[PDB]
Ligand binder design. Structure first.
Ligand code: MG
Ligand code: MG
Ligand code: MG
Ligand code: MG
Ligand code: MG
Ligand code: NA
Ligand code: NA
Ligand code: NA
Ligand code: NA
Lengths: 52, 142, 45, 176, 166, 110, 77
RNA sequence: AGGUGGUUAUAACGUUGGGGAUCCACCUCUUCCCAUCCGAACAGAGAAGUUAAGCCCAACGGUGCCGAUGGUACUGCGUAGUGGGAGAGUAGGACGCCGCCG
RNA sequence: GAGUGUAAUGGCACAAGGGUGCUUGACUGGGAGACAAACAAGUCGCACAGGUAGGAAACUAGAGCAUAGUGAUCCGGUGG
RNA sequence: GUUAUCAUGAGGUAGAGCGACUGAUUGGAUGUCCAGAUAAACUCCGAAUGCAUGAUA
């Protein structure tokens, strides 16, 4: 909350499972139709065997 | 020999025994014991000799309690040493006792054996003593 | 390593101590100048 | 279970009065409990000789002359350090209103099996019990016909009557 | 605000149904997610304390601080001045967004999770690899709940989506 | 540790030097979530000399002015000036400052 | 044969100087103490070495309070 | 059901129940006064919600606290007398008592 | 049951223990009255005038939680 | 000035105690508990005397 110290780039982005926008720092080089910031990931919790 | 595992101080001022014992004048563990009629310092060597004597009697059936522990350091100067120049060479520990304090407690043996076993122990001690039986004792069940 | 100090600037002087290996810069404190009857800066000599 | 005691009135108090009392082979004594103040009176060494010097316990039926008649139990005996003679007694008044803690003898009444060899050992000689004064046994019998090997009967693992075993539960009342 | 709606709109209306509270203030609510890691190796090589700060900030999104020692133990070369820990205390929505970054992507990237709490209802997690997250020498994770026993804590815990076990 | 043990700790620190006599009575304030109160107290006597509050009377800081002024009129009639202001475990800020400022701006040397 | 002892320092003559009931002039020393064995009450001040002294003339009063804490104060008129 | 004092806990701590007219509180959000790694604390802005918790009331001898009478220890004077009289423990007491303001 | 640079003892919760913001009162002229006391020495403390620091203010500040860390006179040095 | 009486005050000795601290310590059941017990440099307690102040004789 303090001005300054907090690092920037913390902007919303939707992760891909291989879609849910979540405020995260990691800004992968991509875009998508706003909610442009996108990151591609491997099997999420929807595809992990034991987790499902 | 009975002595503290460690002490805070190496020397101690020789105190003063004043009156009758107000603690440890009653039997708690056994049914028979011996109690002092004088005030005196009791040494560890005296206690070990008396305990071996009472344990030698009663064969191997019964339990003996020592109800005093020597925690008072004493010293002695020695021959050819004049007065002054500080305290002398250490000489072990003693336990100060006053009249009424119980020394040896015995249980597990009939009345006559206990009376005789503590008589042998009292004859190794520097103070005259007295036999005590607990007031709830039963002469018709031993 | 704690020596006498004399802060200056009749003249106005204040005597005090300080550790010469801990405080290595000359002392400079505001004190009351009796001659001027107001606070002025006194520096070590 | 019952003892007959009587005692004379006591008026003076202090170092001088008490020393003169025992000069006649008497004992100062007090009685207190529940409603009302205490009672100061005098008993004799002959009178209380069989009340205290005994393996038994009794409910003292006390008749203090000049004051009245009550029921009491032994609470505290004061002994001389050297002579081991009685110098003071206080009796707790007992009524049928609330329980009272007292310790009754416990007797190991045959031994279990062949037994481990002359053991049959009574360890805890007395057990604290709280109950109405007219519910306290004269004795605490136990039957011992099980576990002739290394065993122990605890204080908690026993139920006698409408008593209450306050005698430091999870302890050991017999063994071997 | 990803699991925030899922909790207030959906998860809360079920906790009261089962445990049967007479109100809505008796239901457990995790209040913070504390993260920490021990840097005893930094007692002899302290250049790896700043790097931990930089890594411990890209994950949660909010700056962390060093933790100074508190004891004088020679067996760890420890005197009561050294920085040997880095902690971050996420709270309110900051832990809400962080929680979704973990239940979906952290446990999935594991090479599930133990079921044992402190007894007051605070599940703590020590993961031995820091690359389990996207932005990245493990780090502790503690969810301090408003529950009372493990029963109430577990119901709040499993509703979020924590993989847990059995 | 529970929003009150600290306040009582701060209360006793302030009371270590601030009290009230027949002259210079103590000005005491209590801040609730919705209201605000004031009281003039004579510690030697133990009784309250005057009072004001906003229970029966803008944002919360805008209402502390009226409490800070209504306590002046009550003390103005009774003949009180040069009161001493105690924090009562409250930081000197916000609503509490406006109450103190209004009391000073009136007839009291708070 | 020797002693490693034989040392001592001068005693400081500490303690209560004006007892409860007596009259004090302003400035009078009431208690010399190490620490606040006694605490300053009304009209009583404390020095650098915890010396208790009278700020006003009057009657010396001792008073025990919570946790058996002792206070010294002067009763004026 | 609040604020603020006096009385050295017989006043404290705790346990089990009750309480939402209005109050106290938790509660909601950080644009502003102000604050920490974090509106957790502190501060500001509100009344959408609850008595669940703090808080207050009833009952409880549970932990602590108070505590006789008698006897004893010790002791001033004096050479057994003449005066003072503990500590511990036991009967018991105690779930406060009083002022001001709203 | 910790800490309080340093022995021991006494003290400390409104902390005298731990943090930060600003500061130099580790002030000029002072000593009503006491403690202690062979002397020489030692200790605590004013009232108010001048000018400051912190504070919203009340107020506090003539060094440090206290008690050791020391050396007369003669004779010389330095600044007014 | 002294002594007595009354009023007021501050004590930490004798004694006592040890789940009130520190150190030491006995036996049991088994760090937990039940008993037993110690000290110039231990104290949750605590006299008798003595001491200070005022008044009267
Ligand atoms: Mg000395
Ligand atoms: Mg008496
Ligand atoms: Mg003078
Ligand atoms: Mg003694
Ligand atoms: Mg003793
Ligand atoms: Na000497
Ligand atoms: Na006598
Ligand atoms: Na007593
Ligand atoms: Na002990």
């Amino acid at each position: 909350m303090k001005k300054g110290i907090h690092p920037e780039n913390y902007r919303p982005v939707v992760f891909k499972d291989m879609i849910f926008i979540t405020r995260s720092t990691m800004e992968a080089k991509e875009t998508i139709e706003v909610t442009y910031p996108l990151i591609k990931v491997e099997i999420s919790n929807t595809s992990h065997p034991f987790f499902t | 020999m009975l002595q503290p595992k460690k002490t805070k101080f190496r020397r101690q001022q020789k105190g003063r025994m004043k009156g009758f014992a107000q603690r440890g004048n009653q039997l708690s563990f056994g049914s028979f014991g011996i109690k002092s009629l004088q005030s005196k310092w009791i040494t560890g060597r005296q206690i070990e000799a008396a305990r071996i004597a009472v344990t030698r009697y009663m064969q191997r059936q019964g339990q003996v309690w020592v109800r005093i522990f020597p925690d008072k350091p004493i010293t002695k100067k020695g021959e050819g040493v004049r007065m002054g120049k500080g305290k002398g060479a250490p000489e072990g520990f003693v336990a100060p006792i006053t009249p009424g304090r119980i020394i040896f407690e015995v249980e597990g043996v009939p009345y006559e054996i206990a009376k005789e076993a503590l008589r042998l122990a009292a004859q190794k001690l520097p103070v005259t003593t007295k036999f005590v039986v607990r007031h709830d004792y039963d002469i018709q069940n031993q | 390593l704690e020596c006498t100090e004399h802060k200056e600037s009749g003249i106005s002087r204040y005597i005090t101590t300080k550790n010469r290996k801990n405080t290595t810069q000359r002392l400079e404190l505001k004190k009351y100048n009796p001659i001027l009857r107001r606070m002025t800066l006194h520096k070590e000599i | 279970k019952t003892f007959q005691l009587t005692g004379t009135p006591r008026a003076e108090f202090g170092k001088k009065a008490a020393k003169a009392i025992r000069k006649e082979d008497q004992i100062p004594a007090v009685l207190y409990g529940g409603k009302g103040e205490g009672v100061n009176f005098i008993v004799s060494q002959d009178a209380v000789r069989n009340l205290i010097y005994s393996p038994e316990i009794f409910l003292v039926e006390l008749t203090v002359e000049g004051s009245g008649s009550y029921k009491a139990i032994l609470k505290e005996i004061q002994f001389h350090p050297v002579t081991d003679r009685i110098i003071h007694i206080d009796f707790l008044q007992v009524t049928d209103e609330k329980p009272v803690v007292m310790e009754v003898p416990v007797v190991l009444t045959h031994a279990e099996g062949v037994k481990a060899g002359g053991k049959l050992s009574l360890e805890m000689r007395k057990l604290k019990v709280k109950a109405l004064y007219s519910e306290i046994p004269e004795k605490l019998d136990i039957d011992v016909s099980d576990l002739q090997l290394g065993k122990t009967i605890q204080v908690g693992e026993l139920h006698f009557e409408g008593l209450t075993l306050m005698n430091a539960k999870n302890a050991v009342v017999c063994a071997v | 605000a990803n699991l925030k709606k899922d909790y207030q709109e959906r998860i809360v209306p079920a906790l009261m149904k089962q445990f049967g509270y007479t109100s809505v203030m008796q239901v457990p609510v995790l209040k913070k997610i504390v993260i920490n890691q021990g840097l005893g190796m930094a007692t002899g090589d302290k250049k790896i304390i700043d790097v931990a700060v930089s890594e411990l900030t890209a994950i949660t999104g909010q700056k962390a601080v060093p933790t100074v020692s508190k004891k004088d133990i020679s067996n760890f070369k420890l005197r009561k001045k050294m920085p040997i820990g880095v902690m971050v205390t996420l709270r309110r929505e900051q832990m809400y967004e962080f929680l979704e970054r973990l239940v979906r992507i952290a446990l999935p990237r594991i090479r599930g999770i133990e079921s044992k709490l402190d007894g007051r209802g605070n599940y703590t997690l020590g993961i031995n690899e820091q690359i389990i997250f996207p932005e990245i020498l493990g780090m502790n994770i503690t969810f301090v709940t408003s529950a009372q026993s493990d029963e109430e804590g577990y119901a709040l815990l499993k509703e979020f989506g924590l993989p847990f076990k059995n | 540790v529970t929003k009150e043990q600290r306040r009582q700790k701060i209360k006793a620190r302030v009371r270590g030097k601030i009290s009230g006599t027949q002259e210079k009575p103590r000005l005491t304030v209590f801040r609730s979530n919705k209201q605000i109160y004031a009281q003039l107290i004579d510690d030697i006597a133990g009784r309250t000399l005057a009072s004001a509050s906003s229970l029966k009377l803008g944002s919360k800081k805008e209402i502390a002015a009226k409490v800070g002024d209504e306590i002046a009129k009550a003390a103005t009639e009774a003949g009180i000036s040069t009161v001493v202001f105690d924090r009562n475990g409250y930081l000197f800020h916000g609503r509490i400052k406006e109450l103190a400022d209004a009391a000073r701006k009136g007839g009291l040397k708070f | 044969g020797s002693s490693k002892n034989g040392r001592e320092s001068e005693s400081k003559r500490l303690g209560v100087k004006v007892y409860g009931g007596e009259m004090a002039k302003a400035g009078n020393i009431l208690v010399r103490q190490r620490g606040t064995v006694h605490h300053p009450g009304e009209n009583v001040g404390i020095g650098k070495d915890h010396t208790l002294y009278a700020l006003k003339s009057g009657v010396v009063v001792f008073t025990r309070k919570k946790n058996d804490r002792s206070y010294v104060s002067i009763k004026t008129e």
